[PDB]
């Protein structure tokens, strides 16, 4: 088998539909990577930093979870070629009057544990003077956002946008931070090299034959 761990709630990359079924961009791509490569694919959805721990323990073989490729992360993981862009911004409720990172001084800002959002928040904390609240789970972070206990939640643009499209009480009034790495498939550094190659080879074939484009189209994304 090939065991891949993912997030539990990260629409449109992985999420459950109305019949409790796991769907999303990451799900469609990984299933297709497995078919093209003839892998028995065993997906699990424990959560992002849960998936990180399962990967480092060897309980799974790699991760697909909207995971941003970063230079720092490249010291623990090997990544595929990117298959999506990676950008961060502040979600707020619709009725929020905050719009700039300078507004967050002396306020509590959420981030999911182990993520590029938490890293950026940590790197820019002295600059803007917010306090960082951490949650492993996106459900907990956005519950805090809705409850008013955090002034904003940093997360990835496509995920906030998608849920805004679902009519959730969310707005994107802040500038976005573009991260250069994009999203990749990740394995432990020096391990499972051929999973990365298989991912790369299938992804190129999916771009050239147009299956990649069709996956993004399913979820409302113009590529
Ligand atoms: N599933 C996630 O929350 C991933 C968030 C972000 N792209 C990261 O890589 O940390
Ligand atoms: Na980087
Ligand atoms: Na970063």
Numbering used by the authors: 29 to 251
Paper text:
In addition, it has been shown through uptake experiments that glutamate is transported by both SBD1 and SBD2 domains. The affinity can be easily tweaked by mutagenesis, for example, the double E184D_V185E and the single E184D mutation in the SBD1 domain yield a significantly increased affinity for glutamine (KD of 1.3 ± 0.15 μM and 1.0 ± 0.1 μM, respectively)24. An interesting structural difference is observed when the wild-type (WT) SBD1 is compared with the E184D mutant, which has ∼90-fold increase in the affinity for Gln and an almost 10-fold decrease in affinity for Asn24. The shorter side chain of D184 induces a different orientation of the hydroxyl groups, which mimics D417 in SBD2. Furthermore, the α-amino of the Gln ligand is differently positioned and shows hydrogen bonding to the hydroxyl group of T96 (like 28 in SBD2) and the Oδ2 of D184 (like D417 in SBD2). The hydrogen bonding with the backbone carbonyl of G94 is the same in the SBD1(E184D) mutant and wild-type SBD2 (G326 in SBD2). In asparagine-liganded SBD1, Y38 makes a hydrogen bond to the α-amino group of asparagine, which is different in SBD1(E184D) where the interaction of the α-amino group is made by the Oδ2 of D184 and D183. The herein reported structure of the SBD1 E184D in complex with l-Gln, combined with the MD simulations, explains the change in affinity for Gln when compared to the wild-type protein. While the global architecture of the binding pocket remains unchanged, there are differences in protein–ligand interactions. The shorter side chain of aspartate at position 184 induces a different orientation of the hydroxyl groups creating additional space for glutamine to bind with a high affinity, but almost without any impact on the affinity for asparagine binding.
